[PDB]
Amino acid sequence: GVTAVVQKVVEACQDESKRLDLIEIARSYPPNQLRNMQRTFQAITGTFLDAFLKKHLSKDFESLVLMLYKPRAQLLCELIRGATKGAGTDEKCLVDVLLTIETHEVREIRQLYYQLYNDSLGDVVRKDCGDKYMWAKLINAVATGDRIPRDTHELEEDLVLVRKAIETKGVKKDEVSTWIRIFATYTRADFRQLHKMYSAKYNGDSLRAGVEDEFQGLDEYAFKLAHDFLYDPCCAAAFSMNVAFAGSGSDSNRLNRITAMHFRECKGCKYYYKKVYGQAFDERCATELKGVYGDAIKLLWEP
């Protein structure tokens, strides 16, 4: 019963030992029911859940929980807003969000973004990022474009063109269109087919290795992330989590958005994490994160 879940939330907030109940609730019920629960929460208590969570929680666990108890499309918009409004740009955030949402989800947030902010999502991103850097071109094309099915003939053409691109040092002028067309506009099915055609034709060489060769820095992250997401969203989740853990400390902001955006659907993340990085996800978590925050991240990713 919704009114009882409300009680469970209140108690998880008011007892130090019950904090992980917030994560259990988030993972155990569908989004529509969480949204409905929150409406009952305010009806009963007189305060919005968001404000309530803020009064009782702190630091990384607060930031994470606030993200989980939002409709996901609203979360995507807030992240994009947060990354662009005012001085500078959170480029990592934009890449993470834009490149890991399905085409229909992009259309949904274009519409929502305008309702929330009276701004065009595409315009906001282009204004902030420009259209010069390859990561910028990529996210612009995804922000304003569509992923459309194409004929096998087109895949065969593109195979030769991407190989050519991979073979030349640096992104050449005539290569820009190739990288953007494939990574911004291929459907998952077509991308998966090209991925297979490439390794078959080129003695087991991979598109992902070609991306590594061609790009550096944020460009390389962006194209690997688009690669992995098209190949399998669970791969992309593991890659983004690994990157967030990399180096001294870790990027809790990135861990939080990747986990809130993807835990629900990307159940194979832990499998891919171990397969690719050779260490169990929970073991990396153990050495990176502490306390209730670490326990939260491990539990959300547990299928």
Give the binding site for Ca ion (CB under 5 A): 54, 58, 84, 128, 165, 168, 212, 216, 220, 245, 250
Beta carbon of residue 23, minimum distance to Ca ion (angstroms, whole number)? 17
Mention every residue, 6+ apart, whose C-beta is less than 8 A from residue 138.
99, 179, 180, 183, 184, 222, 223, 226
What does the CA dihedral 105, 108, 111, 113 come to, rounded to 10 degrees? -50
Beta carbon of residue 127, minimum distance to Ca ion (angstroms, whole number)? 8
Beta carbon of residue 4, minimum distance to Ca ion (angstroms, whole number)? 25
- DSSP category for residue 16: G
> Which residue is associated with the tokens 């870790």?
250
Q: What is the CA radius of gyration of the chain?
A: 21
Beta carbon of residue 288, minimum distance to Ca ion (angstroms, whole number)? 5
Nearest residue to the partner Ca ion, using Cβ: 168
CB 118 within 8 A of CB 159: no
Beta carbon of residue 249, minimum distance to Ca ion (angstroms, whole number)? 6
Beta carbon nearer to Ca ion, 69 or 233: 69
**What number of H helices and E strands is found in the chain?**
20, 0
